[PDB]
Amino acid sequence: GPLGSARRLYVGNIPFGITEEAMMDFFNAQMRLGGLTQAPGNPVLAVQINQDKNFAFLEFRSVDETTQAMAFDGIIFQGQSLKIRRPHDYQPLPGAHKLFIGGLPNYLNDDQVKELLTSFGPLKAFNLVKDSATGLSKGYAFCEYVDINVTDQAIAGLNGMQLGDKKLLVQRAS
Template identity: 70%
Template sequence: MPGVNLDKNFAFLEFRSIDEATQAIAFDGINFKGQSLKIRRPHDYQPMPGMTEHQTLSMPDNVPVIAGVVSTVVPDSPNKIFIGGLPNYLNEDQVKELLMSFGQLRAFNLVKDSSTGLSKGYAFCEYVDVTLTDQAIQGLNGMQLGDKKLVVQRAIVGAKNANAIAQVPVQIQVPGLQLQSSSGPATEVLSLMNMVTADELKDDEEYEDIVDDIREECSRYGIVRSVEIPRPVDGVDVPGVSKVFVEFNSVLDCQKAQQNLTGRKFANRVVVTSYFDPERYHRRDF
């Protein structure tokens, strides 16, 4: 039963059960019409006998996920991910798009300076499918973005120490985090992310134009052997959709392309690059 106060922009909701009310707490921080909702218990709320305060406020694991809704509150959990070393020119949508290349996000927060509104260069996130946590960490940690490398690890130290993390340059060991480069050594295959979207790849003519444009651009930096851009197929989970893979004639050509393309804009999107295993490329293990 809702009660709405339009003047002060708040409302009270009464649920059918305690469990349903507790589940609703999980949607604290979701974006609604450009605003971040704050969902709290009433000030005079008294927990039921035998229930702790943590139990009344924590996010239950079985909360249904609303398609397309990403909370801006990332709760502390073993699957909370810290992303450091983000270039300041990347906005929320660009960072989110990068992270969502691995799967749907449950929660995401790009930390900003309260006085300027600019990115502080780090963020936190959690995936709907927690089994993607390690995959995303492995794929992103050490990735080169412009003149920086990402530091992506489980947020072991927790959100309370986020300010301490932010004050440490990403090139220095962060307490509680291991700096490891999973991008590996340079190869002749370059993976480009945030360059195309799945919708752009559906139309045959547009797809061919995209392939030609990318081949032409990459040819400026060396001999291009092949270009692979996995396309979406209805009802099929196609690996690597929205990623671009370019095979060069040599490692040196690939390195030159990587240095020139990282941070560049393609269709108003900032390009993110990493080297890719040639054996996986040839067997189309994207």
């Protein structure tokens, strides 16, 4: 962005031969029936389809209704489970999904600690807190994943788990 792409969503695995009007009608009906609309009228203003590569982009009338519609990921439309995602060019603001990692062995270096974390996916930020005078690790760190959906996967996979004779704490830093 930083503020771009806030009112559009990517839709994959669309049904073969479906029209832009039919897709618009389906999504507007689901928004109403699902209770995700925040005002009278239709949230989806327009749909654009790429036939050759079988995907669509929805254009919404507001920022908050776009976010709500991410909940339809996997909905079945004419036999097809839809893939609903943010636009490539969409990015949350810096530090929005920062993680605190505590209970790490203090003899492990930066690259050795990153190896545990990057097993869930690539990182866009990382720092292991060290004593500045001696350069020695204080046993806690902070990180942020490139894909924000990985954040909850890392928490579920690492929080409360055994690492040596310590139990790790992995949680959102704020």
